[PDB]
């Protein structure tokens, strides 16, 4: 890294002294030393960058968003000075973008990243990072255009290949996504050894019929991304008991299970009334998990938050459930009705986290044609009975009956989670 311009070379002694304090952990001392350097040398880019790095370190020490916001501004000040070395320019704005993302100012990060690309149009890596910016805000279209530019200039870029294949796969171009994902992971370029790309490569292969999907699940297990070939959630807490099927007694949630089974007809009747008189409240499944068929969901709780308008449609069910914070407070799960019609097949898939168990309460179950596989075991629902499985394991669903199948889904915290984790885990 070349960081000192002509003027900063003449004051390297004062700059190096200030930086030594930062490397020694005297954070409060180094900020005041760099502050005094900025006052004395208001045009020095190294001194201004030192002040931002110190404000950055201090923000970590105190876990302060306000301090980090000030560092984010000082990083930009560096770019407004005259005669800033290009290496210092990249570093100051790249770090600003990163910290803007860490704060959730995704729109601000994107503006910073766009400036970097305008300043250095030949840096492939900055374009790759701009593509990530677009993906973080969900703009897959602009992300796709970015990575196409990269693959035109550097067509062997592994980072660009996996992210291109991820976008294709997300746009349901399943067959087309596979070579981009396989060639990125195999390139070994930095950023390609990520569970997300193993997850979707094997899922894309499973959908098209290629039997080599297992090998990629195994490789992801060998490289520490998946807890097993079968349990492929990516937002995990280590050590939690891992088994596909659970009994009520094993979960310890026996009061909740008994309440569900004793009052099941009430839950059924409020769901049927919504189907009949408020059908619009059932929304189609929107995660591209279906091969074919009709599957819709009517959600009462999501991420630990009650849906007020939805509970107006099932008020007795919502009253009943409010007694059980183990599900209403589960910020990594949902409470919802789920209806599936004949001719529906749900692709093998896993949920995103191992921090929940998923209960199914049967409400209207045709006597033939409905079944659910989890790991190597297939089971069926019973009206008025609870089934419990860990949906972080691979599972698959078929609906080949002659009428609709309605169940009630109740997610609970994994029982071995401590209360501390239950309140601190980021919602999903």
């Amino acid at each position: 890294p070349k960081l000192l311009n002509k003027f900063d070379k003449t004051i390297k002694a004062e700059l190096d002294a200030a930086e030594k304090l930062r490397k020694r952990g005297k954070i409060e001392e180094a900020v005041n030393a760099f502050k005094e350097l900025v006052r004395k040398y208001p045009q020095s880019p190294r001194a201004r960058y030192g002040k931002a790095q110190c404000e950055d370190d201090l923000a970590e020490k105190r876990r302060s968003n306000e301090v980090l916001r000030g560092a984010i501004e000082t990083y930009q000040e560096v770019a407004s000075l005259p005669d800033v070395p290009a290496d210092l320019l990249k570093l100051s704005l790249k770090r600003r973008s990163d910290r803007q993302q860490f704060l959730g100012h995704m729109r601000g990060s994107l503006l910073t990243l766009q400036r970097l690309v305008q300043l250095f149009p030949n840096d492939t890596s900055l374009k790759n990072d701009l593509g990530v910016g677009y993906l973080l805000i969900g703009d897959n279209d602009n992300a796709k255009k970015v990575y196409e530019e990269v693959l035109s200039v550097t067509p062997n870029d592994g980072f660009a290949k996996v992210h291109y294949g991820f976008i294709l796969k997300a746009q349901n171009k399943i067959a087309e996504s596979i070579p981009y994902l396989k060639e990125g992971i195999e390139s070994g370029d930095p950023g390609t050894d990520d569970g997300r790309f193993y997850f979707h490569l094997g899922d894309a292969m499973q959908r098209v019929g290629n039997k080599e999907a297992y090998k990629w699940y195994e490789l992801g297990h060998k490289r520490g991304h998946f807890a097993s070939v079968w349990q492929r959630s990516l937002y995990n807490v280590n050590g939690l008991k891992a088994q596909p099927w659970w009994t009520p007694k094993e979960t310890g949630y026996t009061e909740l299970v008994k309440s569900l089974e004793r009052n099941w007809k009430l839950i059924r009747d409020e769901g049927l009334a919504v189907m009949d008189k408020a059908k619009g409240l059932f929304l189609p499944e929107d995660e591209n998990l279906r091969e074919k068929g009709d599957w819709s969901q009517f959600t009462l709780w999501q991420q630990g938050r009650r849906n007020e308008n939805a509970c107006k449609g099932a008020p007795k069910t919502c009253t009943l459930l409010e007694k059980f914070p183990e599900t209403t407070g589960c910020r990594r799960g949902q409470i919802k009705y789920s209806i599936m019609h004949p001719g529906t097949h749900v692709w093998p898939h896993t949920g995103p986290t191992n921090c929940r168990l998923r209960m199914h309460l049967g409400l209207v179950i045709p006597k033939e044609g409905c079944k659910i596989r989890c790991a190597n075991e297939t089971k069926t629902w019973e009206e008025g009975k609870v089934l419990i499985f860990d949906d972080s394991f691979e599972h698959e669903v078929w609906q080949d009956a002659s009428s609709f199948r309605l169940i009630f889904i109740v997610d609970v915290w994994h029982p071995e989670l401590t209360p501390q984790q239950r309140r601190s885990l980021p919602a999903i």
């Binding site: 959730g104 995660e287 898939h349 995103p352």
Partner: peptide, 17 residues
């Protein structure tokens, strides 16, 4: 959001410290 599956690039939100 990632409800039944894992389809998003990231499933969580960033809110600082």
């Amino acid at each position: 959001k990632c409800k039944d599956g894992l389809g998003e690039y990231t499933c969580t939100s960033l809110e600082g410290f």
